[PDB]
């Protein structure tokens, strides 16, 4: 009985973290692509671009949060 | 206590009347940054970095940089050193009220006691018992978030009290009414399911919300309560970030132990070096986001209601 | 018994992952326009910030449904 | 007999996830057009907001169907 | 056999979900065009809103199908 | 008795949702052209609306096959 | 045996839905070109409709497949 | 024994659906080119028709495979 | 009997993916070719062979499906 | 006995299908570049054809592994 | 209890592969503009490098969840 | 006896198919610009050619792993 | 027991397939930029190569997880 539950919750949390990773990667792709394009004259605004690159980082967070709570269930 | 205003200054300036913005960041931001960063080995490295900057602050030495065009060094380095060596205290105390970080090969080397290592005093939290401890600290974190939003709404109400366009103070207490209403609803659905004193709470919250509507037909007021609801929830990331860091440190420790137990006659020598370089390389990218997260949280959550929009004074 | 636990875990994971994916898909184009607007629209960075931070309610609601059925666990 | 509960839960998750992804796809174009317009369209700021906030109803629909067939549970 | 209704639950979940997907992908490009059009189309705002609200028929059909399936339950 | 019901329902919902998604994808490009056209082509509003209304025949097919599967249900 | 009718039903659903969005993406770009072409193409709308009715081959083929299978049930 | 038959039928449905989708895309791009080509392509109308007509062979192959599977049933 | 249905859905999936890939190729091939035709009426003969090239993929798919049916 | 046959067959079928999809994606860009080159590269026609030919090497591996897996049967 | 091992293994594989796909998608748009910029930006080579360096942490997160599930063997 | 062989077969097929898909996606983008490069860059032909040979490094892994678990069979 | 190792083989294959897909997707437009660069950037050829080799390090994570799961087998 325990064999099914643990593997099933494991594949579920893997699904969650993988999809969150894909979403944040898609976001960071275009964000950084625009940033490095603007960095030519944005030598003053390099830090300004940096804070935009770190905003999509939040999407991973909920994914590994629910992964952690499901692992704690295991 | 004053020099923390560096972060506040270059946005927050506004058209006068505001009182609150400056004392809140030294009493909040380093605390939650330290809660995020529980690695004492990282904290001592940051202390040594502060020592490295202290070797430059004594001279003028603007020290420039080739890449990022940094020049504004001379005296702001003093207050930057002040804020960093203020926050290292919070991160080191968090690292000791938290679990151990390095060296604690609890399979054989229990540096501080545990039920799996009899002897000295047991550790308070280990994050294997995550079934209970994680739930309690999540409740603690969301409590901090909701009380911070409470203080923000309270200071908005205080502003509305003095300023005679207090019609906005009415919608301000409407914010708190919506918050207590959704709190009662959550306690009804996923709470302990009782409704004895909860009935009065939902009654008062819903009633004062309709009275807030009765002030004027504000079309923008009815959807934004959903945004306010997500705002208290957004604070929850603070545990997940520090849990990710702690699991990183734990798995590095386990890898080092595994290398140093089997090939131990030679595995220790390579293992210490590889563990050090891996920890440093992980640090150099992850700590940027780690330090960037809570200040963004504080900005977007706290300043968004009262002081952000007034066209910089 | 444990099968139900795994299945509702699958539901949680699908919900949170797809909500995160939608939020990221929005945020990508929003910020891509916004950072380009920043260079000459230095005044308009405030509007850019609120536009970028607006669509997070999607993953908020996904987290909400995930946690309520995790209460139903 | 509890096996159906996990099925209805994964139904919850997929329904809300697809709804969130669709409204994110919509908002990605809408808000990007709006922030590009907002330079000259500072007067039309409220128009941009209502245009971008219009597709949010899909989340409401997913929420209501999830809630009703969770009250079924 | 209670497992029957979990399948109808996931079926209506799929139906409503990619109905939302369809209405989002429909609304995105047309509203991106419309918002940019507003700059001269302040007169044509009524046309813009009706084109924007037209695609909702798909999701009202989807929720009708979900409702009749739930009634079948 | 119930096993067939759920499979019929999930096939029905999948079919109608995919039809909805297809109409959404078509209507995206159709409206993207039409809204830009209308601004001066207000005379051609009649042909623009009929072209926008044209793709709905496939969701008509989807709802009729949904109806026959419901009748079998 | 009734569950096998469920299998063939969901096969019909996949077939008709996939044909549906194939037809939608088929009609999308063609209609988008034609609507923009209309203003000069006022004489050519007759052949524009002719080319626009070409994608319906996919839906009629899908529906005849569904029809022969639901005859087989 | 009917467990075989439903699997075969859903195989036919999947095959014809993917064939329809691929031919839809192939027809879509060439039709989008040809419709804009028309205005000067008054002579090239016959070539446009055969170019649009040729991708249907994939639909023919999908049809023959589905029919031989049905004959196996 | 389950093997028969499983090999049937396998060969259907195979030919479906092959058809989809050929459609994706042929879309851009024809889009280039038809636009070329405006001057390429003389060059049409060289144009048609590019359209004819992707057919080998569905040829492979259908022969694999045929050998699977022969195994059936 | 029947369990392994269908599984190995569907595995090799999806393998060759994915390989064909990948090489089709490659040829879609390759021939689009080459034909456009040909308008002046009539001399460089043979030089263009090698780039059309070279993507087939990947489905050579797919056919090879399909034949090997068939020999495993 | 052998099913648990295979299921957690496929979960590890899914998580790692999806994280790898996401960070590859990010690195594509990063380096695509980075290399084009580097012609003028020979001075800014280090500034270009860190933008490639940032999205790599997704691999680290996927490796983390893979290794903890590995330790759950 | 049969379950293991079928499952490893479908694993082999899935791995090699995804490898072929990835290398095809890579080859499309590189060769599309490469072909246009060669026409004027006939001197740079050998230099440009190696980039076409670069993506094969992943499909050689995809085939060697298939070989190694076939040996594991 | 055989089904267990089949499941872990499926997981390994999926991991390496998605890793190869991601690195191919990145290397696609990376090489697309590089071949455009190399025309004048013949001196910068090494800078192109060090950029292209970086996404090749992505798939080695899937390679190592496949190797360690094989060691588990």
CA K67 vs CA A21, B37, K72, M71: distances in Å: 17, 22, 9, 14
Chain H contact present for I28, CB below 8 A: yes
Q: Are E23 and F20 in contact (CB under 8 A)?
A: yes
Q: What are the φ and ψ backbone dihedral angles of G40, each rounded to 5 degrees?
A: -85, -25
The Cα–Cα gap between M31 and M48 comes to 8
Closest CA to L6 of J71, K3, J8, J70: J8
B113: helix, coil or strand? Answer: strand
Q: What are the φ and ψ backbone dihedral angles of B117, each rounded to 5 degrees?
A: -150, 85
Q: Are B233 and C60 in contact (CB under 8 A)?
A: yes
B131: helix, coil or strand? Answer: coil
DSSP A29-42: HHHHHHHHHHTTTT
Contact at CB, G36 and F36, closer than 8 angstroms: yes
Four-point Cα dihedral D38, D39, D41, D42, nearest 10? 90
Contact at CB, F35 and E40, closer than 8 angstroms: no
Contact at CB, G8 and H7, closer than 8 angstroms: no
E34 to chain F: which residues are within 8 Å by CB?
35
For the domain bounded by A2-74, which CATH number is listed? 1.20.20.10
Per the structure block, which two tokens stand in for B246? 């702690």
Burial class of B165 by CB neighbour count within 10 A (0 to 12, 13 to 18, 19+) = exposed
I46: helix, coil or strand? Answer: helix
Closest CA to C53 of G39, A56, K6: A56
D17, D42, D69: best to mutate for the E interface, most E CBs within 10 A:
D69
Q: Are D22 and B192 in contact (CB under 8 A)?
A: no
CA B144 vs CA B245, G46, H5: distances in Å: 21, 68, 60
Sign of CA dihedral K12, K17, K22, K28: positive
Q: How far is CA H2 from the centre of its chain?
A: 29
Residue position matching structure tokens 């144009």: I47
Q: Are I5 and H7 in contact (CB under 8 A)?
A: yes
Rg of the Cα atoms in chain G: 17
Per the structure block, which two tokens stand in for E14? 């799929």
Alpha helices (H) in B40-108, listed in sequence order: 40-57, 73-97
Per the structure block, which two tokens stand in for A66? 């629910």
Q: Are E34 and E48 in contact (CB under 8 A)?
A: yes
B117: helix, coil or strand? Answer: strand
Partner residues linked to B114 by β-bridges: B117
Q: What's the CA angle centered on E54, arms E53 and E59, to 5 degrees?
A: 90
Q: What's the CA angle centered on B149, arms B145 and B150, to 5 degrees?
A: 115
Q: Where are the domains of chain M?
A: 1-73
Chain J contact present for I30, CB below 8 A: no
Per the structure block, which two tokens stand in for D16? 């809300």
Q: Are B87 and B27 in contact (CB under 8 A)?
A: no
What is the number of CB-based contacts under 8 A between chain A and chain K? 138
Contact at CB, A47 and B68, closer than 8 angstroms: yes
D10 to chain C: which residues are within 8 Å by CB?
7-8, 10-11, 14
Nearest CA in chain B to C65: B190
Partner residues linked to B117 by β-bridges: B114
C73: helix, coil or strand? Answer: coil
The Cα–Cα gap between B221 and B203 comes to 20
The Cα–Cα gap between F22 and E26 comes to 9
Q: What are the φ and ψ backbone dihedral angles of B122, each rounded to 5 degrees?
A: -75, 155
Q: Are A56 and A31 in contact (CB under 8 A)?
A: yes
Q: What are the φ and ψ backbone dihedral angles of B114, each rounded to 5 degrees?
A: -165, 160
Burial class of B147 by CB neighbour count within 10 A (0 to 12, 13 to 18, 19+) = exposed
The Cα–Cα gap between D33 and I30 comes to 32
Closest CA to B29 of B96, B73, B89, B72: B89
The Cα–Cα gap between C65 and C59 comes to 10
Contact at CB, A54 and B289, closer than 8 angstroms: yes
Burial class of B268 by CB neighbour count within 10 A (0 to 12, 13 to 18, 19+) = middle
Contacts 24+ apart (CB under 8 A), B276-281: B278/B252, B279/B41, B279/B249, B279/B252
Rg of the Cα atoms in chain F: 17
Q: How far is CA A62 from the centre of its chain?
A: 9
What is the least distance, in Å, from the CA of K22 to any CA of chain M? 7
The Cα–Cα gap between B265 and B189 comes to 59
CA K39 vs CA A49, K30, K52, M37: distances in Å: 21, 15, 17, 8
Q: How far is CA G20 from the centre of its chain?
A: 5
Q: Are G20 and F19 in contact (CB under 8 A)?
A: yes
The Cα–Cα gap between L29 and L51 comes to 11
What is the number of CB-based contacts under 8 A between chain B and chain K? 22
L near D: at least 3 beta-carbon pairs less than 8 Å apart: no
Contact at CB, K64 and B251, closer than 8 angstroms: yes
Q: Are C9 and A13 in contact (CB under 8 A)?
A: yes
- Within 10 A of B52 (CB to CB), how many other CB atoms are there? 9
The Cα–Cα gap between B258 and H8 comes to 52
CA D20 vs CA A27, C66, D50, I60: distances in Å: 16, 13, 18, 40
- Within 10 A of B126 (CB to CB), how many other CB atoms are there? 17
L57 to chain M: which residues are within 8 Å by CB?
56
Is I1-72 a CATH 1.20.20.10 domain?
Answer: yes
Closest CA to H33 of I38, G33, J28: G33
K near H: at least 3 beta-carbon pairs less than 8 Å apart: no
Contact at CB, H18 and I21, closer than 8 angstroms: no
Partner residues linked to B113 by β-bridges: B122
Q: What is the DSSP letter of B123?
A: P
Resolution as reported, in Å: 4.0
The Cα–Cα gap between G60 and G50 comes to 16
The Cα–Cα gap between I41 and I57 comes to 28
- Within 10 A of I35 (CB to CB), how many other CB atoms are there? 17
DSSP F8-71: HHHHHHHHHHHHHHHHHHHHHHHHHHHHHHHTTGGGGHHHHHHHHHGGGHHHHHHHHHHHHHHH
Rg of the Cα atoms in chain H: 17
CA C6 vs CA A7, D41, K10: distances in Å: 8, 51, 15
What is the least distance, in Å, from the CA of A46 to any CA of chain B? 7
Q: What's the CA angle centered on C28, arms B12 and C65, to 5 degrees?
A: 90
Q: What are the φ and ψ backbone dihedral angles of H14, each rounded to 5 degrees?
A: -65, -45
Partner residues linked to C27 by β-bridges: none
The Cα–Cα gap between M36 and B167 comes to 62
CA G40 vs CA E37, F44, G36, I37, L67: distances in Å: 21, 12, 9, 22, 61
L5, L7, L24, L42: best to mutate for the J interface, most J CBs within 10 A:
L24
F7 to chain G: which residues are within 8 Å by CB?
3, 6-7, 9-10
Per the structure block, which two tokens stand in for B256? 């080092």
Which residues, 6+ apart, have CB-to-CB distance to D24 below 8 Å? C21, C22, C23, C24, C25, C26, C55, C58, E24
What is the number of CB-based contacts under 8 A between chain K and chain M? 143
Four-point Cα dihedral J10, J15, J20, J22, nearest 10? 140
Per the structure block, which two tokens stand in for D57? 């109803």
The secondary structure element, H or E, covering residue K19 is: helix K2-37
Q: How far is CA F6 from the centre of its chain?
A: 23
DSSP L14-71: HHHHHHHHHHHHHHHHHHHHHHHHHHH-GGGHHHHHHHHHTTHHHHHHHHHHHHHHHH
Q: What's the CA angle centered on A58, arms A52 and A64, to 5 degrees?
A: 150
Q: What are the φ and ψ backbone dihedral angles of B68, each rounded to 5 degrees?
A: -95, 0
Which residues, 6+ apart, have CB-to-CB distance to G31 below 8 Å? F26, F29, F30, F33, F51, F54, F55, G52
Q: What are the φ and ψ backbone dihedral angles of A39, each rounded to 5 degrees?
A: -65, -15
Closest CA to D55 of A73, M50, C22, J73: C22
Q: Are B34 and B94 in contact (CB under 8 A)?
A: yes
What is the least distance, in Å, from the CA of E26 to any CA of chain D? 8
L29 to chain J: which residues are within 8 Å by CB?
29
Chain K contact present for M49, CB below 8 A: no
Closest CA to I26 of D21, G14, H33, B233: H33
B195: helix, coil or strand? Answer: coil
E near K: at least 3 beta-carbon pairs less than 8 Å apart: no
Closest CA to G5 of B106, K17, H5, K44: H5
Q: What is the DSSP letter of M55?
A: G
Pick from E6, E13, E25: CB nearest D22:
E25
CATH superfamily membership of M1-73: F1F0 ATP synthase subunit C (1.20.20.10)
Closest CA to K51 of C28, M53, A49: A49
Partner residues linked to B122 by β-bridges: B113
Q: Are I5 and H6 in contact (CB under 8 A)?
A: yes
Chains touching I by CB (3 or more pairs below 8 Å): H, J
Pick from E11, E48, E68: CB nearest F14:
E11
The Cα–Cα gap between B219 and A48 comes to 34
B227 to chain C: which residues are within 8 Å by CB?
54, 57
């Amino acid at each position: 009985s325990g064999g099914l539950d643990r593997g099933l919750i494991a594949v579920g949390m893997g699904l969650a973290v993988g999809l969150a990773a894909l979403g944040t990667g898609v976001a960071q792709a275009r964000i950084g692509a625009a940033g490095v394009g603007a960095i030519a004259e944005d030598r003053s605004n390099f830090g300004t671009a940096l804070i935009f690159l770190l905003l999509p980082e939040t999407l991973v967070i909920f994914g590994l949060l629910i992964a952690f709570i499901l692992n704690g269930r295991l | 206590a004053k020099p923390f205003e560096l972060l506040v200054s270059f946005l927050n300036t506004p058209k006068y009347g505001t009182f609150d913005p400056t004392p809140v960041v030294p009493v909040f931001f380093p605390f939650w940054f330290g809660m995020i960063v529980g690695d004492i080995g990282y904290a001592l490295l940051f202390y040594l970095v502060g020592r490295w900057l202290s070797g430059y602050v004594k001279r003028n030495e603007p020290l420039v940089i080739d890449l990022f065009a940094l020049k504004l060094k001379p005296q702001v380095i003093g207050k930057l050193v002040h804020i960093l060596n203020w926050m290292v205290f919070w991160t080191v105390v968090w690292g000791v009220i938290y679990g151990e970080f390095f060296g604690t090969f609890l399979e054989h080397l229990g540096v501080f006691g545990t039920p799996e290592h009899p002897g000295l005093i047991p550790i308070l939290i280990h994050r294997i018992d995550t079934a209970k401890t994680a739930n309690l600290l999540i409740l603690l974190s969301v409590a901090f978030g909701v009380v911070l939003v409470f203080f923000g709404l309270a200071l908005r109400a205080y502003l509305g009290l003095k300023h005679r366009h207090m019609a906005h103070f009415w919608e301000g207490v409407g914010y708190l009414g919506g918050l207590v209403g959704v709190l009662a609803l959550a306690a009804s659905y996923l709470g302990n399911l009782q409704a004895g004193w909860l009935q009065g709470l939902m009654y008062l919250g819903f009633g004062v919300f309709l009275l807030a509507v009765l002030m004027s037909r504000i079309w923008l007021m009815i959807p934004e309560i959903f945004t306010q609801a997500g705002h208290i929830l957004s604070h929850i990331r603070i545990y997940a970030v520090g849990a990710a860091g702690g699991i990183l440190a734990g798995l590095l420790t386990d890898v080092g132990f595994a290398l140093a137990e089997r090939l131990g006659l030679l595995g220790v020598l390579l293992g210490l070096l590889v563990a050090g370089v891996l920890h440093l390389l992980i640090l150099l990218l992850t700590t940027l986001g780690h330090m960037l997260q809570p200040i963004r949280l504080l900005w977007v959550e706290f300043f968004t209601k009262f002081g952000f929009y007034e066209e910089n004074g």
